[PDB]
Design a protein around this ligand. Structure first.
Ligand SMILES: CC(C)(C)c1ccc(C(=O)CCC(=O)O)cc1
Ligand SMILES: [Zn+2]
Length: 117
């Protein structure tokens, strides 16, 4: 079972007015379009960890975490009405964020409108 993150209810979010679309996301820092992660603290959209074979992303999300401490991220394309995949860098697990709908609407996201990939 995934467990409620220790950051789910205490997470402090910054005000980021950028519009997040319901599909077609890109890393802010590179061309990656797969394995993108929205950090719930700042609204950053950045690519996942590079795979051992050099495929996958360019480590931009994890580097961002190492620089900031901002622990929770949601994998874009996994957001549905029923939830999403949320990773904790801090707890090094997939976690539950029962405030996810609130966290997401904070950046103007409607969970009902996001495309599954
Ligand atoms: C806990 C398991 C399933 C093993 C996992 C899943 C995702 C990540 C991530 O680091 C995602 C964010 C990123 O790639 O920057 C790390 C471990
Ligand atoms: Zn990137």
């Amino acid at each position: 079972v995934r467990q409620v993150s220790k950051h789910a209810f205490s997470l402090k979010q910054l005000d980021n007015p950028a519009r997040i679309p319901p599909c077609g996301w890109k890393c802010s820092k590179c061309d990656m379009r797969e394995n993108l992660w929205l950090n719930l603290t700042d609204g950053s959209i950045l690519c996942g960890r590079r795979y051992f074979d050099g495929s996958g992303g360019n480590n931009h999300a994890v580097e961002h975490y190492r620089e900031t401490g901002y622990p929770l991220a949601v994998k874009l394309g996994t957001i549905t009405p029923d939830g999403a995949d949320v990773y904790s860098y801090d707890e090094d697990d997939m976690v539950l964020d029962p405030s996810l709908a609130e966290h997401l609407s904070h950046f103007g996201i409607d969970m009902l409108k996001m495309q599954k990939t």
